[PDB]
Amino acid sequence: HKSEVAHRFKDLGEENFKALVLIAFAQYLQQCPFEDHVKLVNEVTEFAKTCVADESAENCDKSLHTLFGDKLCTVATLRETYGEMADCCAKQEPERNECFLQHKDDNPNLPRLVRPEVDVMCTAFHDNEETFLKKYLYEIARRHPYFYAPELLFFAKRYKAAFTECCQAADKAACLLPKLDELRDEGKASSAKQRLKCASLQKFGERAFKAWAVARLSQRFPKAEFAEVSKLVTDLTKVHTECCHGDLLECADDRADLAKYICENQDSISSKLKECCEKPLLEKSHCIAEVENDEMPADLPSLAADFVESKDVCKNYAEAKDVFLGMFLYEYARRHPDYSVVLLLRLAKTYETTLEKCCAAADPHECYAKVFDEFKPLVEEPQNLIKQNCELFEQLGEYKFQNALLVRYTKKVPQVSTPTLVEVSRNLGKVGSKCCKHPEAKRMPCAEDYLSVVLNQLCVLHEKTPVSDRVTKCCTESLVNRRPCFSALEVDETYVPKEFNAETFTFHADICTLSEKERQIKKQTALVELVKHKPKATKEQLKAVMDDFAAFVEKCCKADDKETCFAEEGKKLVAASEA
């Protein structure tokens, strides 16, 4: 249409318009102060209206990329503050915006945002949330310059919802802290999931991304015929591509295009999309990616007919192989929402290998007549692994559970950072606590999601500075093999325990006045070093020693005097436990 500026304002809404404009500028001009942006966001919302009023107002017919670009190159401290970047202004069109895109900083050099106190948070809220919420939005925006504007928008309107319901409450913190934490982790398990969709696209290939796409998409839209899922896949993949590139506009659009094709052919695709395609343009796509598994036609056969028995199997393969291996995955995938995508993938890898050896051969029919056998062991592993993993967690709490994982993944790899062996140890915890709260039916997919991010923030931290091969081997490995590879570590015979240095195992009264989280971390931390010291430690020598540090805290951080309770009663463990 006529002037893209009005098209956007009218259909997005002055409100949303500002939010996204704020974000968009904040994602590029990471250095400039919040107050600056506010001035931009109005100077622009004020201009925009000029078209929402008579779209043929000077400059309205310009392209948003030209507009966006033109006003960047208007900032002033552009060079003084950005430099290199000021140099895109002398370039051009297509080239000017692309130039700008190459200069946004993955890892910004700002401080960690401290989370102030419920009280000031509240007080500042009731107060003008405009700038309570816009500033914090601005803050998150610049620290994560690649996060999808509209989505960051959606988080925010929940962070808004959050203060709404707690700030006006009895005991505030109690209400909100949980929520806030929950919204926090929610965002990392989204930031990282967004940064993983891409690497995997660049590392393993377009074929791989598609494979995954057909899998996940079928499980979700099981009554959609293959050619449909197939069409939805090619689109996704492209969508997932221009988005990884990072051109927030082209990205947004595609997602909208694909968003509304689906909307316009739901009968072919799904039912459960009724209540999402009634949403406004901005959410259409998000709502959908989050839609819920559609139901199966139940009456559905068995993959045996089409993939083992017939004849022509070998022929239908050769005749264009991915189509085939795709169909295979489709069918297998749609009949098993309860499997995590990568598991259907080895099923595919497995099957693939099998032909490939089989159609090359004396008698294929009898050569592969029996793969489904090769599948059972694959499917059963993660099922046993989740079963007894959620069972162990049923006994011990999140806390006592981590501590299990803590010892376990230290003996298997005591080279790694202690703080790291602690971070991940817990993150795992939460995953247990999360996804064990589901039923078998939805257990595995849910783990793959999280486990897949956690079990990576762990790699990069290890890519930061290497410490093990095994950990580095399981990290170079394929997204498909990455998991088992970990679930297949054994405990480091080679090593020699760490070197007694006590200043460690010594706990001054500090631990009385600390918080729930911190107390546990100081405990878990020593929990590790201790294992790092006496690696061959038993599930019973430990349990004792641990029951000892207990009632030692109970102790010291209790009866009248503290402060040397710990100290005298302290050393009465240090050497004290050693047996």
Ligand X SMILES: CCCCCCCCCCCCCC(=O)OC[C@@H](O)COP(=O)(O)OCC[N+](C)(C)C
Ligand Y SMILES: CCCCCCCCCCCCCC(=O)O
Closer residue to ligand Y (CB): 58 or 299: 58
Distance between CA atoms of 439 and 20, rounded to whole angstroms? 38
Nearer to ligand Y, 346 or 533 (CB): 346
Spell 498-524 as b/e; 16+ CB within 10 A means b: beeeeebbebeeebeeeeeeebbbebb
In a 10 Å sphere around its CB, with 0-12 CB exposed, 13-18 middle and 19+ buried, how is residue 140 labelled? buried
Contact between residue 286 and residue 259 where contact means Cβ atoms under 8 Å apart: no
- Residue closer to ligand X by CB (options 137, 233) is 137
| Residue found by looking up tokens 């093999």 in the block | 481
**Residue whose CB is less far from ligand X, 359 or 489:** 489
Largest separation between any pair of C-alpha atoms in the chain: 86
Token pair recorded at residue 560: 């009248």
In the complex, least distance from residue 352 CB atom to ligand Y, rounded to whole angstroms: 5
What the block records as the tokens of 22 is 């704020």
Q: Tell me: does residue 409 bind ligand X (CB under 6 A).
A: yes
How many residues interact with ligand X (rule CB under 6 A)?
A: 60
Residue with Cβ nearer ligand Y (359 or 573): 359
Distances from the Cα of 149 to the Cαs of 26, 35, 190, 569, in angstroms? Answer: 10, 20, 13, 56
Contacts of ligand X in 130-189 (CB under 6 A): 133-134, 136-137, 140, 144, 147, 155-157, 159-160, 183-184, 187-188
Q: Does residue 557 bind ligand X (CB under 6 A)?
A: no
Residue 420 binding result from ligand Y, ligand X, none, given CB thresholds of 5 to 8 Å by partner type: none
Closest CA to 48 of 76, 99, 12: 12
550 binds, among ligand Y, ligand X, none (CB under 5 to 8 A by kind): ligand X
Output phi, psi for 538, to 5 deg: -90, 160
Which residues form the interface with ligand Y (CB under 6 A)?
Answer: 8, 20-21, 64, 67-68, 150, 204, 207-208, 210-211, 214, 216-217, 220, 236, 239, 252, 255-256, 258-259, 281-282, 284-285, 288-289, 322, 325-326, 329, 345, 348-349, 352, 478, 480
479 contributes a contact to ligand X by CB under 6 A: no
286 labelled binding-site residue: no
Binding of residue 527 to ligand X (CB under 6 A)? yes
How far apart (Å, rounded) are the C-alpha atoms in residues 165 and 183? Answer: 14
Q: Which of 94, 11, 110 is nearest to 52 (CA)?
A: 11
Minimum CB separation from ligand Y for residue 518, in Å?
Answer: 35
Partner in contact with 68, chosen from ligand Y, ligand X, none, beta carbon below 5 to 8 Å by kind: ligand Y
CA atoms within 13 Å, Cβ hemisphere of 106? 4
505 binds, among ligand Y, ligand X, none (CB under 5 to 8 A by kind): ligand X
- Residue closer to ligand X by CB (options 164, 234) is 164
Q: If you write DSSP's letter for every residue of 284-336 in order, what string do you get?
A: HHHHHHT--PPPP-SS---THIIIIISSSHHHHHHTSHHHHHHHHHHHHHHT-
Q: If contact means CB under 5 to 8 A according to the sort of partner, which of ligand Y, ligand X, none does residue 282 touch?
A: ligand Y
Residue 27 as a binder of ligand X (CB under 6 A): the answer is no
Q: Is 197 in the site for ligand X (CB under 6 A)?
A: no
Rounded to whole angstroms, the Cα distance separating 103 from 291 reads 35
Contacted entry of ligand Y, ligand X, none for residue 303, CB cut-off 5 to 8 Å set by kind: none
Which listed option, ligand X, ligand Y, none, makes contact with residue 482 (CB within 5 to 8 Å by class)?
A: none
554 is in an annotated binding site: no
Among 550, 558, 563, 569, binds ligand X (CB under 6 A): 550
516 is in an annotated binding site: no
| Closest CB 529 distance from ligand Y, rounded Å | 39
Q: Choose between 290 and 516: whose C-beta lies nearer to ligand Y.
A: 290
Paired tokens of 436: 């064990």
Which one, of 206, 233, 208, lies nearest residue 218 by Cα?
233
Q: For residue 478, state whether it binds ligand X (rule: CB under 6 A).
A: no
Distance of CA 462 to the CA centre of its chain: 18
Contact between 44 and 62 under an 8 Å Cβ cutoff? The reply is no
Query: Does residue 455 touch ligand X according to CB under 6 A?
Result: yes
Q: Find the shortest distance in angstroms from Cβ 192 to ligand Y.
A: 13
How far apart are alpha carbons 503 and 520 in whole angstroms?
A: 18
DSSP string, 349-392: HHHHHHHHHHTSSS-HHHHTTT-HHHHHHHHHHHHHHHHHHHHH
Q: Residue with CB nearest ligand Y? A: 285
Annotated binding site for (4Z,15Z)-bilirubin IXalpha: 238
Q: Which residues bind ligand X (CB under 6 A)?
A: 19, 113, 115, 133-134, 136-137, 140, 144, 147, 155-157, 159-160, 183-184, 187-188, 190-191, 340, 342-343, 382, 385-386, 389, 393, 403, 409, 424, 428, 431-432, 444, 447-448, 451, 455, 483, 486-487, 505, 523-524, 526-527, 530, 545-546, 549-551, 553-554, 573-574, 577-578
